[PDB]
Symmetry: C2
């Protein structure tokens, strides 16, 4: 009875640790704002598996966030680089450090859909003193509007604390 492409997202520690670092790592240079990135992983019985991830340069106007830019040439290259090394991981969605959805995530997601028709947004909460750290979403099409529904997301890679 599944009208939805994905119904669960398993975000691996790497990713969460990837993003958290990437966030704080660029904070020592007065990083004020949220980070945006791409997710790479595999697909199963509607379980999306998010194995790996890279950051992409992204800007948005803090006064009208319909003014934003995400560098698709970068993402395409960087993903190209990834294929040269890591076996078949695919662009499976994207991420950003929220902590909440943004007015423009729907539009950002639309760009991403170019690379994965069932892109899944995962909002990775970067704050340490902060419920479950990932919150996956996926754009549903409800004139004909568009909005993000919640998809179950938990963390869980095999082997070693």
């Amino acid at each position: 009875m599944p009208e939805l492409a994905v119904q669960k997202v398993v975000v691996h520690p790497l990713v969460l640790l990837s993003v958290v670092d990437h966030f704080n790592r660029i904070g020592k240079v007065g990083n004020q704002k949220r980070v945006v990135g791409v997710l790479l992983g595999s697909w199963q019985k509607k379980v999306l598996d998010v194995s790996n991830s890279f950051a992409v340069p992204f800007d948005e106007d803090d006064k009208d966030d319909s003014v934003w830019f995400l560098d698709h040439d970068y993402l395409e290259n960087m993903y190209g680089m990834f294929k040269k090394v890591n076996a078949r991981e695919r662009i499976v969605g994207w991420y950003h450090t929220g902590p909440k959805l943004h007015k423009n995530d729907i539009a950002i997601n639309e760009l991403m859909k170019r690379y994965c028709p069932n892109s899944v947004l995962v909002i990775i909460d970067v704050k340490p003193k902060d419920g479950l750290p990932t919150e996956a979403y996926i754009s549903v099409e409800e004139p004909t509007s568009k909005t993000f529904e919640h998809v179950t997301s938990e963390i869980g890679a095999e082997e070693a604390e």
Copy 2:
């Protein structure tokens, strides 16, 4: 201190980056060791290894003086890194050993192009197996070999 570095702090990311990258390409009959670049910061002779990317690398299993590491890739990939991550620098390289290889001295020499005090870190990928073993090439005709540098893991938070 006649030595550039005397300690290497390898962060969980790296260790987890590499281990994954290793096993992640194992599901496709990965037979061999992985080689890569380390990115990080420098202090009071403590090298801090914050981040790392894999580079395509091949070596002949019958004469490992026949090997190749793709420097165009590393330069590019690093280029991409600067575009995002703040000042991390190429600080050495890594490979999944588990032991030193005949050619690491040569591979290191290529790397020295990008970091005159490159530090090799052998990241042991096996679970039933300290997981990092940093080295640095010392120049002892005038030979060249790797000395051990203290390496531990330790990033702040969760």
